[PDB]
Amino acid sequence: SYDRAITVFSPDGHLFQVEYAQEAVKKGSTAVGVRGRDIVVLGVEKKSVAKLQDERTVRKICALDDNVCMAFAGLTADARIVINRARVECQSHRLTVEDPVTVEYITRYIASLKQRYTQSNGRRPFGISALIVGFDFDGTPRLYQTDPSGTYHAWKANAIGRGAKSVREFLEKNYTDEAIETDDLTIKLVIKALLEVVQSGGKNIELAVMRRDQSLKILNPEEIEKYVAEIEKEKEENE
Amino acid sequence: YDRGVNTFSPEGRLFQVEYAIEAIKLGSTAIGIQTSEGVCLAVEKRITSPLMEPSSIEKIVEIDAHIGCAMSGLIADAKTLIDKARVETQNHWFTYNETMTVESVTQAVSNLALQFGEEDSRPFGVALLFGGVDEKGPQLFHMDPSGTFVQCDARAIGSASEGAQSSLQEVYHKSMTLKEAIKSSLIILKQVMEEKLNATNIELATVQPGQNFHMFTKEELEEVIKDI
Amino acid sequence: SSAGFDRHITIFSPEGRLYQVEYAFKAINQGGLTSVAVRGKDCAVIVTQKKVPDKLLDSSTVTHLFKITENIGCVMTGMTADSRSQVQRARYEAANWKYKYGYEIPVDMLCKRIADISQVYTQNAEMRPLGCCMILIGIDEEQGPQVYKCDPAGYYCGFKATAAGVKQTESTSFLEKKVKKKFDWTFEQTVETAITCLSTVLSIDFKPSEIEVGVVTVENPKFRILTEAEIDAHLVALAE
Amino acid sequence: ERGYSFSLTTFSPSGKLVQIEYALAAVAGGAPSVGIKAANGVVLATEKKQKSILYDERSVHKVEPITKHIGLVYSGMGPDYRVLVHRARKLAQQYYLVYQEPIPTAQLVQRVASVMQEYTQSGGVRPFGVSLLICGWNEGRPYLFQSDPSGAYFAWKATAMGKNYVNGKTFLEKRYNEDLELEDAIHTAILTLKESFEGQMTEDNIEVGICNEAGFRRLTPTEVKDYLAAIA
Amino acid sequence: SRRYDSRTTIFSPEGRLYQVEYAMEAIGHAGTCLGILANDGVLLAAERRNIHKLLDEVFFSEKIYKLNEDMACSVAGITSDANVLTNELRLIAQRYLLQYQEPIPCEQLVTALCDIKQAYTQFGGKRPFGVSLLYIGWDKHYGFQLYQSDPSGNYGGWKATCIGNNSAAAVSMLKQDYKEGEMTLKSALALAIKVLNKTMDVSKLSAEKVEIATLTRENGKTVIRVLKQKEVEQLIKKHEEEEAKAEREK
Amino acid sequence: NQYDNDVTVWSPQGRIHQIEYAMEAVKQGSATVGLKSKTHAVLVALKRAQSELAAHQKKILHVDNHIGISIAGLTADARLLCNFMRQECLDSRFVFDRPLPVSRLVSLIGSKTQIPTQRYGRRPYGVGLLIAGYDDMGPHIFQTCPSANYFDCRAMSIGARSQSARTYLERHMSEFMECNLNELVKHGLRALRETLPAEQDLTTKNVSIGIVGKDLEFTIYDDDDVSPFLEGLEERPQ
Amino acid sequence: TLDPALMRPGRLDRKIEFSLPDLEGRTHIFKIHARSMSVERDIRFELLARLCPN
Amino acid sequence: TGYDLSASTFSPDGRVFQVEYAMKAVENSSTAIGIRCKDGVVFGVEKLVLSKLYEEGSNKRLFNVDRHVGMAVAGLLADARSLADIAREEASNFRSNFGYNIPLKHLADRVAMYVHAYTLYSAVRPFGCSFMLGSYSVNDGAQLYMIDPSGVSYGYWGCAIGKARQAAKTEIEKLQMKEMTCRDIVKEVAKIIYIVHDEVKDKAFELELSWVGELTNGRHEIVPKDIREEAEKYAKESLK
């Protein structure tokens, strides 16, 4: 029993809590993600690992089902509620309709979760921003995004976290279909984008792909070094 | 800077409902015209990035089979009203075997425009334009976050609100035709927008008495622009 | 000093005090009335004046001497609207003692039930603490007479002779000088001291029309409100 | 009520809780009390005054029994004390209805402090202004615990509360040893209560309850008059 | 009416939290816990905050709470707030066993608690918890594990973490000195006695101011050992001897 | 100024300001005039439009076969009391099988609006009514207010600049008994035209008339059947 | 900074203030401060003044 | 200030200003008196007409709660119609459980508790009403009661509510009360309404009289007003 409105209007015509919530997304680690026609890719930066500690619990890319993949920013406690909320719904969709869940259906579930959660009384709004990646039936790879207000879109290359606009600028002068032709070219492109933001000393990048046929595979840290080396080799030919 | 949320002004108006009307003005513009041949309807998408896929963004949303919509303001606050407006037509058809009329839809929507409180939240932040064909011909209605339901002949809302209405009263009469009302609207649009008019920034949806299934895509849209 | 909202709601002060409850102790004194309770060896006297400002007002619907049960009476000071709300609670929980337990409620156990309720009003911050006092009398089996006093803070104790209302520090100072000299206390010895204490403190020397006497006796345990004639009978008798 | 339920105790910008520290201030300015655990029983001694000669001493009791072997005194304020007495009375009954066995003294204090803590986090209310001293002789070994308005339990050999408790704390630190008898514990308990008392120490100015292994026992004023001969 | 509400729910205008920041910046005062593992075994060194000469210690487990047959914890924060969570976390592990007849794994015990700690920050305007605690235990999937808990509801897997803010110098020592798969129950214990000697301000490390709980996997029993008195004392005499031996080169 | 925010708070002058602010919301609406006779209960309202092409906002709305109201405030509180009003008439129709008297209907309304004017967190209903009914003791005209005071009047007007309409009805209150329908109505629309500026008037686009009578069910006329009534008028003098 | 002794009749009598342009007075100033510089002849000035309320 | 916003807080000297504020709200209302003769109670209300402003007989403040019980409300009129519904509803449940008519001593008590309950919490406000309760019974005589916004309710012979409070009961007490038939009292009421409130502020005023007693067989009803009209004819005989 708590009857207290928290989110109200402003005299100029805005809100307060949503703009305060998107600052928490702005104070978070960056995570980008591109797509293609056959395989997808998404990565995350700013590991900042203590290098003496465990790291199987620090994973910030998860999966809702055998198609749908996650990548968030913002704070971490509020992300965990959203994920365990979404795993239930994509499992209960499979209960009634015998399909795999379409990636568009689950993003409407998260966005409608978050909108009624800013609407009601006594409730602090969420502080995450997810990247939802999955290839539906008939082989349609796509990626959506969320917002703490509860809106959602379809992008071809997203960036969030601490300093996305530089990454959004770096992806802005990168409008090539040829980079979305070869698979390893797309992955080094994400590594090229993530190294443009983070200091990226070969141990702060966690990328993961999905070939629209199999569950996601975290690449090996040798392959992160293998892709960064060929990124350094192809960039050294500027003369 | 924190008074009550449910408090009359000393002048007599309300506080937060007054602020809700102001939040519409920063939204995307939209134009609708009622004509006896049919109701047309126009909107601007306002794409922010080429990476963003355009067709995931919509403003025209169908309601039952013959009733369209047009939102302006906040996106996700409108999706609550849209889903309810769809259901209440189905409650009407599966209790009466007839289509709920366009006026009587908007009555059902506007009931919970001002039902916020502590017992039994905040006012919504979207204006709407319902248009369709019922037994009384083609109709076009307008509502607001104050729940003030009204009928207009050709209303234009969004950011370009005052300049759009003034240019629209300039050229409008009772005996319009449908193709005339379509090409008149986009002339108003490309005067009030900031990008160029193409197949990706605007979209139309026209409902006729015969073609009740309102249906408008690109490659007819490109035909409309190149003929004007 | 004042921290937070310690002048407004029932929370603590930095000095380890609170303020609303001790405002309520001098919410009695806006009533403008003083009542005296004296317990003797086989009786218990309650005496209280009344002020009649209007001639267009009854001499029946005024007196604060109330009857809780057939063997327990009381007197109320403070404001009047809070007093009668307090009395209906005391009437209600006296009857529930009969229905649950079977025998007549002791006068001591009733003051616990009242002071618990006044505790909670102090305790939860969103309600008013009911400023009015409470004095009970009654005869207990194998314990004789008792006199108690509930308070709006929520505590009670037994007494031998203790007044309340506006004038206590002159009235209790006189009763101490009366008790500690170790005199006899029979019936009319107890009634005469209950008058003369209220007589000397108020300094009135009145006509027998303002005060009311509510004595209970061992030989007659019924709560009894004295007639104005026999009130005049005691007053001229102690008069020499 | 309406449905407010907002906690009026939040963290300071320093990182402390404000109202609990103020509630401890009310306990420190209360009536002094002492409790000593002495290898065959535990002795509780409070200090009861009367502002007049008009009060009655056979009416309000400070040493209060709980089961048949568990006593309880306090040092804070008065009306809040009687609340959690009646709470603890019922709380020992659900143990005895279920387990058919007298509740251990450690088991009460886990339950009473859980009542008291959960009381402070919930909304609309203030904390209590009472600290407690609970004792009992269960399973051979006697016990002596102390609670507080925060809701934290301790296990003292000999402590004191109320006014001038630090003076009584240093006194017991020199007076108490590894072990005594029960009567020696009563003699030093009156000694430390006579530290901060006033001149009249009669059978009515103090009020003493013991816990034998035979059970709880409250002392009548006759023995306390007789035991105060050549006190301290 | 509404003007007494402290508004613990609203974000900062900075765009971050405001009330949960107070508890996390409080929690570093008054309490020092740590724990180490590299091999079969895991320990928990505590610190008696106040040891007065008039206490009893009749419980023989003051800060360590054996919450299960396979797990235990070390709490540092409000004492009254500790009894709320540890009574709840103990009951979480027990309804799991009722449902599955199988011992609860350690991660989904921690995520069970941290979701409770989060939800009392968002809705209600309730006071958040002032508790950061640690976790040890053994399961059938990974084995000996350590976990850190926060008042926000955020957790993590560790190998040498701590709680108290006086232990910021200790984590620097642990980054300076830690091994990878070389824990004995002499190596990790002498390392923990080395840490609390420097980080705590107790001169010569009085053995009644510390407390150590270990956990080994015996046959199938997972014996939770709590060592009592003299093994600590001879450990300190061992540590002071290894200090006195090594300083001969100076 | 600090005690002009809540409904619960009284004043050091003794007057609750939140009710007084709700009176001013009624004055922001358009004007309307209700009057009666021996057999009829004609009320005439004045519509407003938002733009030149939008429709005029409706005022008179049907309640039952012998009760119809006008409107003078917010539109949410309009339909909220209307749906309460329709509900109460059919319940007495379903239970007692008789139409409600108008007098005991309105006491349900004054009881209904009382509760949100005392409890915390509620606003008063910022709306005023003009109820025109007909029952076994004749026609009736009832006006209300957000202060939950209902008035058994014989002719009133509420809205904007309704004072000049009241001054018309004071010097013509005697004529209102012995008039049938035509001079009963064209008395009433002479009251609205004194609430207008001197450059526009009733155009059969901004006027509605509701009549309920003895053998006459409550009927709303607008935009087509007002032209038989808008005849035999005059211009206003200068 | 208003003297009532100046508004005594004999010194200062008439109040003339200036207010902000509605739409067209703004667009006129855009038409003023563009003709002196090299701009495109195919651009409009109404849209710019709509972006500038105050 | 600072202490006068809620009904839960006290003042630093120990009173409640929200009750104090609502008391002077009733004081700024028109005059209503009530007086009992030896076999009945007569009600009188001065009722203001501004110019026309309604019919002749709108919004009467002489409510009719029970078959033998009257009202003389004055103050904020909307809250007065609430109490009339509460007092009506209370007497009905007395009829249902029991089944003799409600005594007037209870109906004063049962209502004034509901008034008093709105003077505790910060949720609700105090009522701004005050009123008279008049009855007659052949077993109990006539009784006259009087409720304030605080809840203090007791007996009177003659009281007066409104602006003319002390100015009207100045000359009520000049009369007799026991040596009067109520038919004589009816024209005695009408002069006092005619004496007080000179028409300087308000030209038009009505005079509604209600009358329960022996002659009306205990049934409460309005006086025959247009019938016989002897009050105002006798009232305007006081021009000098």
Swiss-Prot record, chain A:
Phosphorylation by ABL1 or ABL2 leads to an inhibition of proteasomal activity and cell cycle transition blocks. The modification N6-acetyllysine is found at K226. InterPro entries: Ntn_hydrolases_N (IPR029055), Proteasome_alpha (IPR050115), Proteasome_alpha-type (IPR023332), Proteasome_asu_N (IPR000426), Proteasome_sua/b (IPR001353). One of its GO terms (biological process) is proteasome-mediated ubiquitin-dependent protein catabolic process. It is found in: Cytoplasm; Nucleus. It comes from the Eukaryota. Changing A111D: Found in patient with severe intellectual disability; uncertain significance. GO terms for cellular component: cytoplasm; cytosol; extracellular exosome; nucleoplasm; nucleus; proteasome complex; proteasome core complex; proteasome core complex, alpha-subunit complex. GO terms for molecular function: identical protein binding. Glycans are attached at S129. Induction: Down-regulated by the ribozyme Rz3'X. Up-regulated in colorectal cancer tissues. CDD domains: proteasome_alpha_type_7 (cd03755). Keywords: Acetylation, Cytoplasm, Glycoprotein, Host-virus interaction, Nucleus, Phosphoprotein, Proteasome. Belongs to the peptidase T1A family. Component of the 20S core proteasome complex involved in the proteolytic degradation of most intracellular proteins. This complex plays numerous essential roles within the cell by associating with different regulatory particles. Associated with two 19S regulatory particles, forms the 26S proteasome and thus participates in the ATP-dependent degradation of ubiquitinated proteins.
Swiss-Prot record, chain D:
Induction: Down-regulated by antioxidants BO-653 and probucol. Down-regulated in response to enterovirus 71 (EV71) infection (at protein level). Phosphorylated on tyrosine residues; which may be important for nuclear import. The modification Phosphotyrosine is found at Y4, Y22, Y74, Y119. One of its GO terms (cellular component) is proteasome core complex. GO terms for biological process: proteasome-mediated ubiquitin-dependent protein catabolic process; response to virus. The modification N6-acetyllysine is found at K68, K169. The keyword Phosphoprotein applies. Its main location: cytoplasm. The modification Phosphoserine is found at S5, S12, S14. InterPro entries: Ntn_hydrolases_N, Proteasome_alpha, Proteasome_alpha-type, Proteasome_asu_N, Proteasome_sua/b. Keywords: Acetylation, Cytoplasm, Nucleus, Phosphoprotein, Proteasome. It is found in: Cytoplasm; Nucleus. Pfam families: Proteasome (PF00227), Proteasome_A_N (PF10584). The 26S proteasome consists of a 20S proteasome core and two 19S regulatory subunits. The 20S proteasome core is a barrel-shaped complex made of 28 subunits that are arranged in four stacked rings. The two outer rings are each formed by seven alpha subunits, and the two inner rings are formed by seven beta subunits. The proteolytic activity is exerted by three beta-subunits PSMB5, PSMB6 and PSMB7. Belongs to the peptidase T1A family. This is Proteasome subunit alpha type-2. It comes from Homo sapiens (Human). The gene is PSMA2.
Curated annotation (Swiss-Prot), chain F:
It is found in: Cytoplasm; Nucleus. SUPFAM superfamilies: N-terminal nucleophile aminohydrolases (Ntn hydrolases) (SSF56235). This is Proteasome subunit alpha type-1. The modification Phosphoserine is found at S107, S174. The lineage of its organism: Eukaryota, Metazoa, Chordata, Craniata, Vertebrata. Belongs to the peptidase T1A family. One of its GO terms (biological process) is negative regulation of inflammatory response to antigenic stimulus. The 26S proteasome consists of a 20S proteasome core and two 19S regulatory subunits. The 20S proteasome core is a barrel-shaped complex made of 28 subunits that are arranged in four stacked rings. The two outer rings are each formed by seven alpha subunits, and the two inner rings are formed by seven beta subunits. The proteolytic activity is exerted by three beta-subunits PSMB5, PSMB6 and PSMB7. Interacts with NOTCH3. Interacts with ZFAND1. One of its GO terms (molecular function) is lipopolysaccharide binding. Component of the 20S core proteasome complex involved in the proteolytic degradation of most intracellular proteins. This complex plays numerous essential roles within the cell by associating with different regulatory particles. Associated with two 19S regulatory particles, forms the 26S proteasome and thus participates in the ATP-dependent degradation of ubiquitinated proteins. GO terms for cellular component: centrosome; cytoplasm; cytosol; extracellular exosome; nucleoplasm; nucleus; proteasome complex; proteasome core complex.
UniProtKB/Swiss-Prot annotation, chain H:
The modification Phosphoserine is found at S238. SUPFAM superfamilies: N-terminal nucleophile aminohydrolases (Ntn hydrolases). Keywords: Acetylation, Cytoplasm, Host-virus interaction, Nucleus, Phosphoprotein, Proteasome. The modification N6-acetyllysine is found at K52, K201, K225. Its main location: cytoplasm. It is found in: Cytoplasm; Nucleus. The keyword Acetylation applies. The keyword Nucleotide-binding does not apply. GO terms for biological process: proteasome-mediated ubiquitin-dependent protein catabolic process. Induction: Down-regulated by antioxidants BO-653 and probucol. Up-regulated by bacterial lipopolysaccharides (LPS) and TNF. Component of the 20S core proteasome complex involved in the proteolytic degradation of most intracellular proteins. This complex plays numerous essential roles within the cell by associating with different regulatory particles. Associated with two 19S regulatory particles, forms the 26S proteasome and thus participates in the ATP-dependent degradation of ubiquitinated proteins. Belongs to the peptidase T1A family. This is Proteasome subunit alpha type-3. It comes from Homo sapiens. The lineage of its organism: Eukaryota, Metazoa, Chordata, Craniata, Vertebrata. The gene is PSMA3.
